């Protein structure tokens, strides 16, 4: 367990959150 491993999982989850909000936008605009 390291600072780099924690920073990596934070980056990955934050990018996943941005993509989840974009998916929801896309799916609502589609309808």
């Amino acid at each position: 367990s390291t600072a780099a491993g924690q920073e990596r999982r934070e980056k990955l989850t934050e990018e996943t959150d941005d993509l989840l909000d974009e998916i929801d936008d896309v799916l609502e605009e589609n309808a």
């Binding site: 491993g5 924690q6 999982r9 990955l12 989850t13 996943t16 959150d17 993509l19 989840l20 998916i23 929801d24 896309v26 799916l27 589609n30």
Partner: protein, 45 residues
């Protein structure tokens, strides 16, 4: 014109079905992304 109208209708039908499939697949990816993000946060906890 009758033949054009029919071909344009069938392309529309086609794109409509494709859109439906893409939308369904994206709803599935949405759910799986969330489940993986939760497992990431559980494993890094």
């Amino acid at each position: 014109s009758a033949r054009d109208i029919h071909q344009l209708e069938a392309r529309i039908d086609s794109l409509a079905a494709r859109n439906s499939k893409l939308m369904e697949t994206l709803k599935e990816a949405r759910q799986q992304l969330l489940a993986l993000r939760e497992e990431v946060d559980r494993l890094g906890q």
